[PDB]
Amino acid sequence: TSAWNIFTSKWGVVQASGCLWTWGNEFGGVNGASEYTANTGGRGSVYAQPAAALFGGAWNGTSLSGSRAALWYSGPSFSFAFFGARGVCDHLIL
Amino acid sequence: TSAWNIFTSKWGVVQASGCLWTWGNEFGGVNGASEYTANTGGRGSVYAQPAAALFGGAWNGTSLSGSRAALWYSGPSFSFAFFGARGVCDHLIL
C-alpha cells in the first residue's frame, strides 16, 4: 500500500525500513531458556541466550516501522519470512 | 569538592570519570516494556528495549564512579543532565 521508494534513505538505501526486519549485530532484550539448549544447528549449546536485535520493522509492522524500530525478542535461532538482513562495513581511506 | 585534574587518565583524557556519565555503544541490562513503544523521537517503535550502557559515573556518585563504573538501567530514550558523551574511533597506521 506504499511504493518501494517511499522507504529510500538519505543515502539511497533502498527499502531501508518497513519492509523486512534486518538482523542486527547486537545482543540484549528477552533471554531464552536459562538452561543449556542445543539450537545452533548442531554446533553446541546456549545458556540463557539473549535475543538478537532486529531493526527497521517489516511490511506488516504498520506504524511501528522506521529508522529506529527495534525488536529485541527473537533468538538467534528463530526464523521468519519477514526476517532478512542488510550488510555494512567500515570506510577505508588511504 | 575535588579538582578536575584528579580525573585525568594516563593518556590525557580530561575528566575521564566521575564528572559526567558517557553514553556507551553496548546494550544489555534492564529491558523496557515487552510491548511496542513509540519513544524514538518519532522514528519507529521499540519492544523489550534493553538499556544502553552508561560509563564512568557523574559528579554526584561519590564512591560509585571510576574507570569501570557502569550503569545498565537507562533506556536509550532517557535524557538527564548527568548524561553526556565521549567519542572514540579506530587507530589507522599506513
Place this chain on the structure above:
Amino acid sequence: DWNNQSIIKAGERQHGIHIKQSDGAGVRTATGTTIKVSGRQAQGVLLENPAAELRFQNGSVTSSGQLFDEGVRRFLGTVTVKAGKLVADHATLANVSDTRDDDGIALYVAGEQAQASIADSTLQGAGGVRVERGANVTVQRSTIVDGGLHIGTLQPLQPEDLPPSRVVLGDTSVTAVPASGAPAAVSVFGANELTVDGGHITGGRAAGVAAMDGAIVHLQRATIRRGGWYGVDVSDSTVDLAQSIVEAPQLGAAIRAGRGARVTVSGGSLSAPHGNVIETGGGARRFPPPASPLSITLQAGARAQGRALLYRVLPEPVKLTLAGGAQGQGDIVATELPPIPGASSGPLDVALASQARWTGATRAVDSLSIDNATWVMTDNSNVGALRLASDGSVDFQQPAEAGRFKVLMVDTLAGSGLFRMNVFADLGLSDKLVVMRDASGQHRLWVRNSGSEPASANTMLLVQTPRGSAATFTLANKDGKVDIGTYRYRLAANGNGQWSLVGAKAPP
C-alpha cells in the same frame, strides 16, 4: 453417535475425530471411546465448526505425533477447538512426544467461538492447557499434571486487536513440573480474565502465577507453592487474593508487582520465612504522568510474615495498605542507592487503617499514616511524614535486653495519635521520638516501666521537636502520672519543644 469404539489412526495428518467447518450443524456425542493418534501433525480431536457441539465422556484422547500448524507457526494441542463447544467428562487428554519436537499441548482452545468445559478430567504432556484469542473455558474437579495453564500471549510479531479470553476454574489443581520448562505454573498475558475457585497451583520455573500486560486474575481459596521464585508476579494488571495461601523460598518473594500493578489480598496468608513478602520493580517503564502508582492492599484479616514485609526495588513509587484488621510482620526495605544518582524518585507510602497491625522496623518509608491501627515498632526507625488519627498508635516494642532503648526519627508529624514508650528509670534512659522539621497536633504518650527501682528521681528526655513547634503532648498514663517504685513522674515541656519526664519522691 460414537460408542465404546477404538479409533486409532497411525495415519499421518489423520485426526481421531474431526468435525469439518461446514459439516453437519448439530450435537455430536461419544462414550467410552478411547482414541490414539500417532500420525504426525494430527490431533486426537479437532473441532472447527461454530455450530457443532462435541460431548466426550468416559473416554481417553491421546496423541504422539508432532502437532503444529503453519498458520502463524503455533503449535496445536492433542485436542484443539477453533470453533464450537467441547464438553469433557471423566476424560484423559494426554500428549506424549519430545521436548524440541513438540510442545506437548494437551488442550488448545482459541478463537471467538471456541468453547470448552472440562469436568472431572485429567490433562497431561509438558505443554499443558493453552487458551487464547477470545476463547471461553471452564474447568472443574480436574488436573493439569505437568504442563500448566497459559491464557493469551504477548506480541506474535504484530498488533493485538482485542477480544478477551475468559477462564474459570472449579477446584482443579494446576502443576508445572520442572521438566516441562514452563516459566510459570499459571500465566495470563494481555487483556484476559482468570477466575480460580479453590485448588492447588504448584510449580513454575520463575513464578506460580504470572499476570502481565493488563490481565484480570481473581484467585480464591487457591494454595500456591513451589514444589529466586515468586508466588505471584504482576505487571500492569489486576490480581485479587481471597482466602488463598502463598509460600515462598529464601531466594524469593510471595508477591512481586511492578509497572502500575494493582494487588488486593483479602483473608488468607502469605509467608516468606527468609525472603520478602512483597517485592516492587525489575522491568522498567518510565512515564512522567502519575498513572496507577503500583499499589498493594492487605485487608480483611490477611496474615503476612517474612524477613521483610515489603522490599522496594528502587525508582518506582509504591502504595502499601494494611486495613480491615490485617496483620503483617516484616520490615520494609529499599535498595539504599538509586540507579540514577540526582533524579526524581517517587514515594514509598504505607497506610495502616481500620484495625490493622504492621509489626517491624524501617528507614525506607517516605510517608506513613496510622489511623485506628497500630505500628508495633521493633527497632530504630526513619519515616518522612508521619500522620495519625482516631487512636492510631505507634507501640514501641518492649525490649528483651534491659537498658536497650529504641528511637523513632521523623521528618514531619501531624494529626493525633498515641505512642507507647519504654522507660528504664534506674538507668535514667528512655525511648525517644525525634521530629526534625515540623511537628503539630495533639499527641499522647503512654509510659511502660521496663527497668524498675530508681536510686534517685531523674529526668528522662522523651520527645524532641523543632524551634517553637505547635505540637502538644500529654502523658496518657491515668492521672497524668506514672509511679515507678517510690517515685512519681509527670511529663513537662521545656524550652524549645523538648518534652521530658521529670518526677520526684511520691506523695506519702
